[PDB]
Write a protein that binds this ligand. Structure first.
Ligand SMILES: Cc1cc2nc3c(=O)[nH]c(=O)nc-3n(C[C@H](O)[C@H](O)[C@H](O)COP(=O)(O)O)c2cc1C
Ligand SMILES: CC(=O)Nc1ccc(C#Cc2cccc(N)c2)cc1
Ligand SMILES: O=C(O)c1cc(=O)[nH]c(=O)[nH]1
Ligand SMILES: [Cl-]
Length: 355
């Protein structure tokens, strides 16, 4: 380990006693944008090709860490195979009043109710424009960029909010995420998606992103049936499974366990894996899934891959372990793939459903 141990057992715990969660978040974004990051060689086993793109490795940074697109380059430096920014809202909005981010150290969990604090499409548009061609080279080198699209608190036409997002940031993105799963803000989902896809199809070819839908882990069985049906009917390019949970699993110990918000981290892990498993089966393994929820090790990552994920993301784990957790997850995942007889990540995708 080395750096891993220093960060996990000394640094992060020190920073956590000195800074509230949102200050820590804000300072992490600044340092990451500045390249102030701890100083793992990518191997051919971790490469994934999906959503029409090469991913040097399958470990991405989930939405919500870089909501405004300020640290994209620093996140590739940290070793993420792909970066997702957002959620971005059409117009700028401040989000919920503070405090709105809460630490549950005894559960390796976080509760957040940011409320889609966003700089807005226009600010984020120019931020991405200033590095558009640098990003084109990154994408070509297997380091793609995703943009997560939200809706303003006050909007009166949710589908037009997403359509404006497709129009404004779609041309700068490798894939788009239609986030219909924040807990902080069937033919009707079909209405929404039909309209996002038509707007996406209306973009010039070199500027035409894949479109993914991100779902909650709190869906009824009927909701998952209806989502799987529409996704396959409309040709949605993939799913992100899952957002945070508004449930509170039995056994939470943190004093702030009853704060309103979505719960992330280790108590969400297997709820998210089970939702990946179900969605993979309802879509017959034909719809790429990015698996997200409580990933902090190679075993966490592989369990979601085996359940049906082509790619994984993490966020809360970064808040406890720091940047070295990216190399840790990737090192452990490679070793586990060899240990279980998988030629590479690709071979492991959905492996549980074939056993
Ligand atoms: C503080 C915080 C903010 C988040 N903001 C967003 C967001 O704006 N949009 C989004 O789709 N997901 C958001 N998420 C969800 C993450 O992208 C991810 O789905 C979730 O936290 C599970 O992964 P994790 O357990 O590894 O963190 C947020 C999560 C956290 C903890
Ligand atoms: C809620 C939340 O976002 N929490 C959080 C996220 C990230 C960090 C960090 C960090 C870090 C550590 C070393 C170098 C650099 N650039 C950044 C801390 C807290
Ligand atoms: O901005 C938020 O509060 C937020 C959005 C989202 O999609 N997920 C989450 O946990 N929080
Ligand atoms: Cl648990």
């Amino acid at each position: 380990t080395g750096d891993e141990r220093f960060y996990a057992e000394h640094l992060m715990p020190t920073l956590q006693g000195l800074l509230d969660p949102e200050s820590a978040h804000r300072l992490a974004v600044r340092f990451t944008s500045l390249g102030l990051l701890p100083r793992f060689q990518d191997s051919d086993m971790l490469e994934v090709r999906v959503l029409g793109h090469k991913f040097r490795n399958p470990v991405g940074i989930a939405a919500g860490f870089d909501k405004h697109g300020e640290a994209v380059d620093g996140l590739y430096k940290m070793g993420f195979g792909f970066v997702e920014i957002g959620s971005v809202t059409p117009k700028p909005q401040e989000g919920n009043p503070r405090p709105r981010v809460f630490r549950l150290p005894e559960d390796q969990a976080v509760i957040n109710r940011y409320g889609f604090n966003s700089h807005g499409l226009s600010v984020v548009e120019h931020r991405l424009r200033a590095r558009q061609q640098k990003q084109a080279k990154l994408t070509e080198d297997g380091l793609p960029l995703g943009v997560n699209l939200g809706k303003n608190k006050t909007s009166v036409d949710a589908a037009e909010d997403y359509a404006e997002g497709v129009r404004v940031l779609g041309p700068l993105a490798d894939y788009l995420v239609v986030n219909v799963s924040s807990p902080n803000t069937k033919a009707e989902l079909r209405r929404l998606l039909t309209k996002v896809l038509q707007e996406r199809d209306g973009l010039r070819r070199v500027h035409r992103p894949a479109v993914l839908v991100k779902i909650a882990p709190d869906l009824t069985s009927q909701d998952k049936e209806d989502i799987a049906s529409v996704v396959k009917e409309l040709g949605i390019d993939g799913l992100i499974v899952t957002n945070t949970t508004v449930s509170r699993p039995a056994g939470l110990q943190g004093a702030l366990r009853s704060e309103t918000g979505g719960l992330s981290g280790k108590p969400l892990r297997d709820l998210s894996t089970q939702t990946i498993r179900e969605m993979y089966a309802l879509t017959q393994g034909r719809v790429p899934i990015i698996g997200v929820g409580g990933v902090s090790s190679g075993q966490d990552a592989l369990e979601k891959i085996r359940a049906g994920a082509s790619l994984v993301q993490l966020y809360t784990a970064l808040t406890f372990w720091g940047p070295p957790v990216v190399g840790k997850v990737k090192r452990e995942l490679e070793a586990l793939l060899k240990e279980q007889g998988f030629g590479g990540v690709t071979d492991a995708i959905g492996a549980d459903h074939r056993r």
